[PDB]
Scaffold this active site. Structure first.
Site, mmCIF file in Angstrom:
data_model
loop_
_atom_site.group_PDB
_atom_site.id
_atom_site.type_symbol
_atom_site.label_atom_id
_atom_site.label_comp_id
_atom_site.label_asym_id
_atom_site.label_seq_id
_atom_site.Cartn_x
_atom_site.Cartn_y
_atom_site.Cartn_z
ATOM 1 N N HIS B 39 0.799 -1.219 0.000
ATOM 2 C CA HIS B 39 0.000 0.000 0.000
ATOM 3 C C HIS B 39 0.843 1.286 0.000
ATOM 4 O O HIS B 39 0.289 2.376 -0.148
ATOM 5 C CB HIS B 39 -1.115 -0.048 1.055
ATOM 6 C CG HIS B 39 -0.757 -0.041 2.516
ATOM 7 N ND1 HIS B 39 0.047 0.889 3.133
ATOM 8 C CD2 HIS B 39 -1.240 -0.833 3.512
ATOM 9 C CE1 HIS B 39 0.078 0.641 4.436
ATOM 10 N NE2 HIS B 39 -0.705 -0.385 4.698
ATOM 11 N N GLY B 140 1.715 5.693 10.959
ATOM 12 C CA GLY B 140 3.070 5.572 10.462
ATOM 13 C C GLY B 140 3.777 4.276 10.846
ATOM 14 O O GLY B 140 4.954 4.121 10.526
ATOM 15 N N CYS B 142 2.973 1.251 9.827
ATOM 16 C CA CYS B 142 2.854 0.216 8.805
ATOM 17 C C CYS B 142 4.237 -0.353 8.457
ATOM 18 O O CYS B 142 5.222 0.366 8.328
ATOM 19 C CB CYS B 142 2.241 0.717 7.499
ATOM 20 S SG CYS B 142 0.669 1.569 7.746
HETATM 21 C C1 LIG Z 1 1.028 3.340 7.495
HETATM 22 N N1 LIG Z 1 2.282 3.515 7.857
HETATM 23 C C2 LIG Z 1 0.034 4.485 7.266
HETATM 24 N N2 LIG Z 1 -1.246 3.965 7.764
HETATM 25 C C3 LIG Z 1 -2.337 3.707 6.922
HETATM 26 N N3 LIG Z 1 -2.313 4.166 5.619
HETATM 27 C C4 LIG Z 1 -2.197 5.629 5.392
HETATM 28 C C5 LIG Z 1 -2.021 5.696 3.919
HETATM 29 C C6 LIG Z 1 -1.695 6.796 3.132
HETATM 30 C C7 LIG Z 1 -1.613 6.611 1.762
HETATM 31 C C8 LIG Z 1 -1.859 5.372 1.186
HETATM 32 C C9 LIG Z 1 -2.163 4.272 1.970
HETATM 33 C C10 LIG Z 1 -2.257 4.451 3.341
HETATM 34 C C11 LIG Z 1 -2.577 3.436 4.384
HETATM 35 C C12 LIG Z 1 -3.515 3.145 7.459
HETATM 36 C C13 LIG Z 1 -4.797 3.015 6.679
HETATM 37 C C14 LIG Z 1 -5.292 1.692 6.175
HETATM 38 C C15 LIG Z 1 -4.439 0.773 5.607
HETATM 39 C C16 LIG Z 1 -4.981 -0.392 5.114
HETATM 40 F F1 LIG Z 1 -4.186 -1.326 4.589
HETATM 41 C C17 LIG Z 1 -6.317 -0.683 5.213
HETATM 42 F F2 LIG Z 1 -6.805 -1.852 4.749
HETATM 43 C C18 LIG Z 1 -7.142 0.221 5.823
HETATM 44 F F3 LIG Z 1 -8.465 -0.056 5.907
HETATM 45 C C19 LIG Z 1 -6.646 1.416 6.285
HETATM 46 C C20 LIG Z 1 -3.557 2.797 8.830
HETATM 47 O O1 LIG Z 1 -4.488 2.241 9.394
HETATM 48 N N4 LIG Z 1 -2.427 3.047 9.608
HETATM 49 C C21 LIG Z 1 -2.434 2.754 11.016
HETATM 50 C C22 LIG Z 1 -1.808 1.630 11.526
HETATM 51 N N5 LIG Z 1 -1.773 1.395 12.832
HETATM 52 C C23 LIG Z 1 -2.302 2.297 13.673
HETATM 53 C C24 LIG Z 1 -2.907 3.481 13.259
HETATM 54 C C25 LIG Z 1 -3.513 4.451 14.240
HETATM 55 C C26 LIG Z 1 -2.951 3.700 11.885
HETATM 56 C C27 LIG Z 1 -1.274 3.620 9.110
HETATM 57 O O2 LIG Z 1 -0.344 3.900 9.849
#
Ligand code: A1L7Q
Ligand code: A1L7Q
Lengths: 296, 297
Positions: B39, B140, B142
């Site tokens: 992603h 952040g 991920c």
């Molecule tokens: C990860 N480091 C960022 N993140 C995301 N995303 C933000 C983003 C920006 C541009 C393109 C893609 C993304 C994903 C999410 C959202 C997310 C991701 C998926 F894979 C899904 F299936 C979904 F439904 C939503 C996200 O949730 N987090 C995250 C992780 N852990 C905790 C928290 C509070 C947020 C990201 O960090």
């Protein structure tokens, strides 16, 4: 809310084993010195009644086996500061981090890297109890394991492990070898003082709840600090210091709830007793103001 | 008696930042490959409904900025399920002995939470029956990984992809296959009904005994079947004979038969704990495995 340890890599690269005769434990290798509990110079029989100044005058450099894994580090000097032995070795640790030695206050949390035979086995967060013990998870062989905080790649060393007490809690020193609490490194009838709840941390936990929108317990009252301290002690809570009031300042500012207003709220929880806060029936006392911020 | 993570050093030296455009997250650098959530190739708009094979074909190597504390040059990319694999020009000199494993529900692992490629915290998590994990992850995080260590070999089992609306976490193994029925798209996703890991609760009750807490024991016994009836009633996982076998060491060590401990748990589910606590908890803890308990008791 989880208890999160700091990443342990920087400390892992400093752990060594120190052996005197058959007595062995862990030590901490920073630059060209190895720090360890001075009780390594004892036989188990000596512990019943040790005279350290003498046991040490009689040691020589060549009596100390210091090993990083299976590589020996030759010792070129020995001294003791309080209850820690300092062994000058002929090699400066290339993996030495930026570091300091800090003497923490009761309530402060830190990461423990448990080690056996110089080899790290696990990492977890611990709080210094008001009675200057820690509720650790240590097995025999763990002496010389260290506690630390990490602040921008500077490792602040705050704890070195010396012993298990009767009730199963842990005691040790700072890295200058001064014990936390009234304990001594000899076999006696020693016992932990009766412990109390860490008020500063409970208040931090209440701020955490407020930040998350869980704020039923906030009331219209305020209290004086002196009044609060006198009541708190009646419920086996620690009194606050000025330093405590100050470390709550950032959370006070974040929520717009004054410290003494939160103290009022706490006082009421104590006097009436609760209904949950952060989906828990118990008030948590092992997250510091810094922990709360570091997680939220 | 605390949750204890593995020392994180071997993993710390593998974490990097990966960036595409204004999208950034963490990657795992092993030999000459960086593994990260695919992603990263999406904008927020793409992520609302991504066609990954179609987005990826349109990328070039130079669109990927990898940073290891040094920019690493990407010289090749591929996708394996939901994981992107960037071949880089430099092998990671601190690569540990490692394997990629898919964990079973109920099993535990250490998480190394990271931000902008930089390690930030380490703690234990379990893979829940509904294939979520209750982590402490912020925006952040991920690409943070989960792992176990056995004699210096790191077995990676989790890569973090998202937080669900309920505040729990979902991710993949290192082959990019999701744990659970989730997808890597920005759409609202619920997990299935979670259940409690019975074998682990029993392990933890044994821990409590080994640590000198015995108030919840009773003189009574139960059969496996009758215990399981009660457990299912309270949304606990079935206890199998293999679980009873696994608990054999702790049973031997405390002199409490597994089915006797099961009778204790039944009473706890039916009566509550009243006022009381077990190993400091007001709640029945299910995130220690028998192995975790042994490794500490
Ligand atoms: C990860 N480091 C960022 N993140 C995301 N995303 C933000 C983003 C920006 C541009 C393109 C893609 C993304 C994903 C999410 C959202 C997310 C991701 C998926 F894979 C899904 F299936 C979904 F439904 C939503 C996200 O949730 N987090 C995250 C992780 N852990 C905790 C928290 C509070 C947020 C990201 O960090
Ligand atoms: C430490 N790595 C070993 N150990 C000890 N000791 C065993 C031993 C053998 C020879 C000489 C000295 C010792 C100390 C103790 C006992 C101990 C420690 C002190 F500091 C004392 F002042 C004392 F009188 C006795 C010990 O308690 N533990 C320990 C630590 N943490 C947990 C557990 C279960 C045990 C040791 O590991």
């Amino acid at each position: 809310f989880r208890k999160m340890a700091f990443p342990s890599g920087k400390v892992e690269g400093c752990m060594v084993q120190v052996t005197c005769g058959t007595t062995t434990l862990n030590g901490l290798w920073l630059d060209d010195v190895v720090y360890c509990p001075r009780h390594v110079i004892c036989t188990s029989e000596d512990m019943l009644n040790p005279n350290y100044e003498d046991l040490l005058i009689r040691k020589s450099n060549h009596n100390f086996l210091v090993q990083a894994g299976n590589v020996q580090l030759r010792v070129i000097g020995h001294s003791m500061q309080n209850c820690v032995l300092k062994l000058k070795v002929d090699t400066a640790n290339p993996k030495t981090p930026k570091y300091k030695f800090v003497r923490i206050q009761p309530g402060q949390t830190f990461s423990v890297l448990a080690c056996y035979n110089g080899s790290p086995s696990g990492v977890y967060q611990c709080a210094m109890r008001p009675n200057f013990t820690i509720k650790g998870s240590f097995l025999n062989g763990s002496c010389g394991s260290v506690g630390f905080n990490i602040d921008y790649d500077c490792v602040s060393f705050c704890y070195m492990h010396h012993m298990e007490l009767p009730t199963g809690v842990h005691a040790g020193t700072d890295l200058e070898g001064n014990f936390y609490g009234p304990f001594v490194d000899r076999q006696t009838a020693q016992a932990a003082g009766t412990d109390t709840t860490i008020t500063v941390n409970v208040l931090a936990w209440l701020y955490a709840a407020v930040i998350n929108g869980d704020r039923w317990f906030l009331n219209r009252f305020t209290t004086t600090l002196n009044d609060f301290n006198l009541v708190a002690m009646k419920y086996n809570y620690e009194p606050l210091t000025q330093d405590h009031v100050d470390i709550l300042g950032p959370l006070s500012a974040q929520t717009g709830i004054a410290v003494l207003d939160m103290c009022a709220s706490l006082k009421e929880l104590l006097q009436n007793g609760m209904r949950t806060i952060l989906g828990s029936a118990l008030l948590e006392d092992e997250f510091t103001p810094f922990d709360v911020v570091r997680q939220c």
